[model samples]
Target: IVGGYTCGANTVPYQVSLNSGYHFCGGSLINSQWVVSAAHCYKSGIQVRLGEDNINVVEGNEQFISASKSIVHPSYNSNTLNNDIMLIKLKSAASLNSRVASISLPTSCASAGTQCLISGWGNTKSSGTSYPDVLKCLKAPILSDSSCKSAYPGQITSNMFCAGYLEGGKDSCQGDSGGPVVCSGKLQGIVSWGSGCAQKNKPGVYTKVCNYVSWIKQTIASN
Candidate 1:
């Protein structure tokens, strides 16, 4: 993510590197066989890697698997970015290990003023497009709905939420799309989109994961 620091190796076990012949985006594993990401991040030829910190290197503990299917939310609108969530089923279940695991989805919605953590590989500058070799993390506090509405006008929907620094210089940029926003160690939001990389009074917007819990479970159960 933008203006973030490197996460210590193996600290984020649920983190997955989505590779579409290269680093496509960031995603979080929900189970050994299922991953959650932004609906807009989906593309063909995607593979996922777990238990690895550096995307450029293949650590011995890393587990790589192909994506058998990519399911974008049916109501998702690419133009408005409403309902921007997706799940990818792995061709094979990842073998259980200390370093490879899934994150728990939040039972309740994330309240305003709560601090959360988001991680991915990207430059510290919002205008820059370069990605780092390892994962980086940034702290984002949830903005109140009214405050977020003020910043985004009617663009902010019920299925979406806002977070980031008010002063600027922090956000999820190119290499961080579809990454997880963890609150109290639970998966709460998914990196969706923003007005710019990181702008003053313009916080980054995310897909509220709690709003789609029922759909997520129904889809997973049916799958």
Candidate 2:
């Protein structure tokens, strides 16, 4: 992501890279066998890379798994981008280890002033070539729905929320979609889309994770 820092090796155990021949999006491990990401992230069969920092290399702690199935929310709208979250079931459950673990899901709604962290291996430039091979992270603040509404106009919805700065500088850029937006050490949001990376008055948009916790649990149960 643009303005993101290189994270320590294998530090973010819950972070996962979604790949289809190449890494294109990020995701979070919510359980041993379940991954949470933006519905728009998937492209047919998928694979995930866990327990690694540098995505270009194989590591001792790396655990690769094939996605058995993907369950996108039924109400998701590709045009308006509503309900953009999705669930991916691993063909085999991830084995718990110091290098791989699940993140806690948000128990309630994220408040407007809360700060959050977003990490991904996306390119640093919005329109140039600067893709990072290792994981990168950055801090962003959750903005009020009113403020986000002002920036996005009619695009903001109840299923979506915003994070980043009005002044612009840092944000989850393209290829960061489906990544986790962690607040208070809990999974609070999923990177969905944005007007542009770190553009003035335009913050990064995300799927509200708390709002879909029940749906996630039910989907996993039935799967």
Candidate 3:
């Protein structure tokens, strides 16, 4: 995340790195067997890395588990970037502990101006490649739908909402997509897309997790 601080160890226990050979996107462990990420981050041969604080260092707390299957939202639209959320079933259930656990799904949507936390190991720079070895986090306010629609006219949809400064400086960037955006200790959003890294008037857009709570539960039940 750009303009963020290094996350304290175990501060974000539910965070997962969507790894193959390396960390590409981030996700959140929603249960012992299910993870939530952005649909765009889906790919074959995904390995979920949990309890990871620093990617470059081998922390003994880390756990690596392969993905058994991924279910992208049925109506996901790549063109408009709507319904960008996805669910991933793990090969084995993640062992819950102090360093690895699951986050609760939001029961209600966050309103505009609510402060939220976003965590990831994405690029720290706005213009260049400066991905951090350690997980980074930032606090930003959720923007109203009217404001978000104005920020990206003809693009922002109800399936998505934005969080960050309208003036720019702090946001989730490349490699941060599919990461968790927690509000009130609940998984409220998933890092989806943005115009740029913390660009003025262009906040980071995220999948509205609250909007798909029923879909997530139904998909898991049927699968």
Best prediction by TM-score = 3
TM-scores for the candidates:
0.97, 0.98, 0.98
**TM-score between model 2 and native:** 0.98
What RMSD value applies to candidate 1?
Answer: 1.1
| Cα lDDT of model 2 by residue, 143-192, tens digit | 99999999999999999999998888789998889998999999999999
lDDT of 3 at 14: 95
Model 2 stretches astray by more than 4 angstroms: none
In terms of lDDT, model 3 sits at 0.93
Candidate 3 lDDT over 1-223, as tens digits, reads 9999988987999999999899999999999999999999989999999999988789799999999999999999888889999999999998999999999998899999999999999999988888789999999999989999999999988889999999999999999999999999999999999998988999999999999999999999988
| Lowest-sum lDDT 10-residue window in model 1 | 122-131
Question: Which pairs, if any, clash in model 1?
Answer: none
| Alpha-carbon deviation at 103 in model 2, angstroms | 0.7
- Per-residue lDDT, model 2, residue 96, is 83
Q: Which rank order by TM-score, best down to worst?
A: 3, 2, 1
Clashes of each: 0, 0, 0
Candidate 1 residues 47-104, lDDT tens each?
Answer: 9988879888987779989999989999999999999999999999998688898999
